[PDB]
Symmetry: C2
Subunit: 49 residues, 2 copies
């Protein structure tokens, strides 16, 4: 049926330092409008399955 | 950069009647545990970009 438990980060403001772990799960603002924690136009979830 | 503003339904309880449209965006419980509207193990968002 397809596993969807495994996910990876897709969006970040900046790259990661070596041996750095990022676990933050917050709405990513790709535009010039606040997202207010709402997925929508130009407001994407950071993790992808 | 990748247009991510186009999304489609991926999970639903059953098929659609002809000429029917659905817009609900509540979490999908793929397992035997309530998800409380939180993405996680066996709980996925119904839409994909």
């Amino acid at each position: 049926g397809g596993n969807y438990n495994y996910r990876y980060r897709l969006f970040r403001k900046s790259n990661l330092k070596p041996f750095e772990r990022d676990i933050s799960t917050e709405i990513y603002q790709a535009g010039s409008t606040p997202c207010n924690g709402v997925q929508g136009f130009n407001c994407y979830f950071p993790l992808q399955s």
